[PDB]
């Protein structure tokens, strides 16, 4: 548990439906959502691989569970069920205990995906932006659509806004 | 000017169980368990089963007189019977190794 | 005249899924039987709208 989901970001966004993780920017030009496509695609690939690993790693053979025994062979019968029930027990203890664990793991995975996304932009904005809580930032300068597009892309160009940000922050 | 990072929420009411918390509402889930069936008998390995109707294996293999509507079959994947077949051995008696014979006749090439 | 991989005394289980709870007695390549009522694996994330 990394403290990003149900942590410093209390709730999710219903309006951002085309991804799992995203940004919400607010400018003079306007406000808007933008899902992060790369992280969402990587997470989708991971979840798909996990589901396929759970599903397609059980290859069985043609068997016919079920045998007929008369009165004169009860031990025989009592052995057969001891096999059958036994197998069921194992599977019923594995599958039920399997899903649970991966469920937890999945709920950790998404959390990490959010947390890293919060860290990456932090390392990009530095002192040029101030954390206002709720897991997001307020800029010390004027960011147009180009600035926020660059922040989302991964190339903020910190030095260019450094001096105005310094002038506005030292207040 | 603010940029905020969040995640996705929807109207889903699906719940999953977790090792640490029970009844966790999630946006999406996949079922690893099948609870439904076709409700009809169907072929296995491309070979149809041998339907016996009102007969049993003993009656069909002994040639009960009222077991003639059965069509000739050269190969079957498995056998289908009624829980309590009535037209079996017309003349009463004991059928030795009946279960062994049933197991041997389950599938023939 | 279907083409199934598993058969139960009530019907066929057309399953790519690994587990089933229809009937313990089965014929063919069939999912393993479990005494479980719900086995759902989460693909998305927590819903906090």
């Amino acid at each position, epitope marked *: 548990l990394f403290g990003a989901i149900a942590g410093f970001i209390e709730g999710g966004w219903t309006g951002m439906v*085309d991804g799992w993780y995203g940004y919400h920017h607010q400018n003079e*030009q306007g406000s808007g959502y*933008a899902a992060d496509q790369k992280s969402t695609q990587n997470a989708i690939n991971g979840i798909t691989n996990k589901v396929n690993s759970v599903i397609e790693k059980m290859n069985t053979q043609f068997t016919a569970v079920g045998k007929e025994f008369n009165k004169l062979e009860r031990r025989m019968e009592n052995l057969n069920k001891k096999v059958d029930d036994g197998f069921i027990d194992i599977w019923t203890y594995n599958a039920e205990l399997l899903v649970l664990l991966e469920n937890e793991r999945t709920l950790d995975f998404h959390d990490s995906n959010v947390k890293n996304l919060y860290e990456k932009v932090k390392s990009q904005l530095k002192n040029n932006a101030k954390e206002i809580g709720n897991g997001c930032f307020e800029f010390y300068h004027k960011c147009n659509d180009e600035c926020m597009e660059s922040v989302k892309n991964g190339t903020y160009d910190y030095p260019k806004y450094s001096e105005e940000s310094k002038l506005n922050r030292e207040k | 000017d603010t940029i905020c990072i969040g995640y996705h929420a929807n109207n889903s009411t699906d719940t999953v169980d977790t090792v640490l918390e029970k009844n966790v509402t999630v946006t999406h889930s996949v079922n690893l368990l099948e609870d439904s069936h076709n409700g009809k008998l169907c072929l296995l390995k491309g070979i149809a089963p041998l339907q016996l109707g009102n007969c049993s294996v003993a009656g069909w293999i002994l040639g009960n007189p009222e077991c003639e509507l059965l069509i000739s079959r050269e190969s079957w994947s498995y056998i289908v019977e009624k829980p309590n077949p009535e037209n079996g051995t017309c003349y009463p008696g004991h059928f030795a190794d009946y279960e062994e014979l049933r197991e041997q006749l389950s599938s023939v090439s | 005249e279907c083409d199934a991989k598993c058969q139960t005394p009530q019907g066929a289980i057309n399953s790519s899924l690994p587990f089933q709870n229809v009937h313990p007695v089965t014929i063919g390549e069939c999912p393993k039987y479990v005494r479980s009522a719900k086995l759902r694996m989460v693909t998305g994330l927590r819903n906090i709208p």
Partner: antibody
Amino acid sequence: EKLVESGGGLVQSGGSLRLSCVGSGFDLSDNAFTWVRQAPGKGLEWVATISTNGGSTYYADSVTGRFTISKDNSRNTIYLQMNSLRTEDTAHYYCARYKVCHRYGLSCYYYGMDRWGPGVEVVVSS
Amino acid sequence: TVIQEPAMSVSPGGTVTLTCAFSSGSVTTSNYPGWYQQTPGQPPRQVIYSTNSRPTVVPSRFSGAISGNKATLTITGAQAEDEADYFCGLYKNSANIPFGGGTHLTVLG
């Protein structure tokens, strides 16, 4: 299910236009849309896209900050407001509708565009 | 980026193939290679979506597949109404679908 495009023409450099596309035969509330352009002597280039509910919006790196794609569900219309047009914006513009895909409860952009529009020729000059 | 061939030709009733490849990588089924036909004066039409899936309306002369890390559109028995520009749209982890330059298929007459 047809899309009809309109609102383009000859505009001076540094001006503005508002291309509009009207869809007849379906509802826009559950489909994602895109605007694509073909420059003269060049291949098809992605311009902008809008999600199913209109919340998410993405722009090409060359037209960011000048283009705004919006959706009006009441009129069944998709608008591309183009501002501060430059000479490189001369093209033939198509409005296309993304095919419906649903991956783990999310809307997709996998399969591409199923319904395109006839196109509108936008030319700028000085 | 996506690379196509500038122009190709085919005689009527002849089978032709159009290729679509990345400039610096390979094209797999996860790229969902779509094929769009554009006639002059009319909207482009999605001939192929996914690797091989084809819409009902589109004639069955058009089939597609991934061959040699390259998407391919095959037209078997090219009629006279298949003289258009064919564009290949690939998927790269975003809504930004990169398009090919275009291939002008000339049905010789």
